[PDB]
UniProtKB/Swiss-Prot annotation:
Cofactor or coenzyme needed: Mg(2+)
Catalysis: reaction(s): (2E)-geranyl diphosphate + S-adenosyl-L-methionine = (E)-2-methylgeranyl diphosphate + S-adenosyl-L-homocysteine + H(+)
Any one GO BP annotation for this protein: terpene metabolic process
Protein name per its UniProtKB record: Geranyl diphosphate 2-C-methyltransferase
Broad class of enzyme this protein falls into: transferase
GO molecular function: C-methyltransferase activity; magnesium ion binding; S-adenosyl-L-methionine binding; S-adenosylmethionine-dependent methyltransferase activity
Entry EC number(s): 2.1.1.255
Entries under PANTHER family matching the protein: GERANYL DIPHOSPHATE 2-C-METHYLTRANSFERASE, ZGC:194242
Source organism, top-level taxon: Bacteria
InterPro entries: Erg6_SMT_methyltransf (IPR050447), GPPMT_Stmyces (IPR049645), Methyltransf_11 (IPR013216), SAM-dependent_MTases_sf (IPR029063)
Xref: Pfam families: Methyltransf_11 (PF08241)
UniProt KW keywords: Magnesium, Methyltransferase, S-adenosyl-L-methionine, Transferase
Function: Catalyzes the SAM-dependent methylation of geranyl diphosphate (GPP) to yield (E)-2-methylgeranyl diphosphate (2-MeGPP).
């Protein structure tokens, strides 16, 4: 049962979603992501733009940048081991969960509003024989079954724009143990610009999301016992990904809005890593 008419919309969006730009990239190595990439493009791997196999090399390179984004996130989760539980809030098809389990060996619990995504991720976990440690469930990340203080580290990778931040960080704060770690990577509108620009609103309209101001992230964390130890503006680092994507046959139409808004300073891609204290 959906929490709100809006979360019903979001369950529906993601139950229906199945774009080539996500699935073809995932097929590269069975890590299915729904987030963007960071880091320099590997021009040597790409080769000659005129070559017959170029679109496939671009696919492989975009995927590499998306996986690199997740590795950067996990660099900030502190240490974690097989006895620990990690929570992926808004877990998509579960690519980040597989990566986390591989890296840390932890139990990894994911929650998503999409039954299709949860099924897909659990089928993937079974194929990899890691289903005894990695599990996706259909659940509102604002209201989860995890016990108070049970969780060692958790994160939101491009999923914070679908929820009230105070309610979100309240919940992470509840299930994270004292000394626990939280990380988000998000696109937020830059309070320096003043208000959400037209580009930001176009992005909101495209995904049915609600991009928050960087000011709102910091405030919501301060009000919920999450204290940032690292904040990185990844805007420069994600532009190469988007500029390459823009040349791809798998474009979705929103590429210009991300590029222009990143360039004019109205929109930014940030990582915030915080301690639960
Ligand atoms: N209230 C809510 N509760 C649980 N998941 C939510 C949610 N609102 C949005 N989501 C999830 O957020 C995801 C956005 S896509 C990002 C997926 C994943 N974090 C990745 O990086 O690959 C979708 O899985 C969507 O179902
Ligand atoms: C940084 C921000 C504001 C993301 C907005 C929310 C959202 C739907 C991310 C999904 O990426 P995706 O892999 O599902 O979509 P795409 O097909 O455009 O790559
Ligand atoms: Mg994508």
């Amino acid at each position: 049962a959906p929490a709100t008419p809006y979360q019903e919309d979001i369950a529906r969006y993601w139950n229906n979603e199945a774009r080539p730009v996500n699935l073809r990239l995932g097929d590269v190595d069975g890590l299915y992501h729904h987030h963007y990439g960071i880091g320099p493009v590997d021009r040597a791997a790409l080769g000659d733009p005129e070559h017959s196999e170029y679109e496939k090399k671009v696919i492989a390179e975009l995927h590499r940048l998306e996986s690199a984004q997740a590795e950067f996130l996990m660099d900030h989760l502190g240490q974690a081991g097989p006895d620990d539980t990690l929570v992926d809030a808004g877990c998509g098809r579960g690519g980040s969960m597989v990566m986390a389990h591989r890296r840390f060996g932890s139990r990894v619990e994911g929650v998503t509003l999409s039954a299709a995504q949860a099924d897909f991720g659990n089928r993937r976990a079974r194929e990899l024989r890691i289903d005894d440690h990695v599990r996706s469930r259909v659940c509102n990340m604002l209201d989860t079954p995890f016990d108070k203080g049970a969780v060692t580290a958790s994160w939101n990778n491009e999923s914070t724009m679908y929820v009230d931040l105070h309610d979100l960080f309240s919940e992470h704060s509840r299930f994270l143990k004292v000394g626990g770690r939280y990380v988000t990577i998000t696109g937020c509108w830059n309070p320096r610009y003043g208000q959400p620009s037209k580009w930001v609103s176009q992005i909101n309209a495209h995904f049915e999301c609600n991009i928050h101001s960087r000011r709102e992230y910091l405030r919501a964390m301060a009000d919920n016992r999450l204290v940032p130890h690292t904040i990185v503006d990844l805007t420069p680092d994600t532009l190469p990904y988007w500029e390459l994507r823009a040349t791809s046959s798998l474009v979705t139409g929103i590429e210009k809005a991300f590029i222009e808004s990143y360039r004019d300073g109205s929109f930014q891609y940030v990582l915030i890593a915080a301690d639960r204290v």
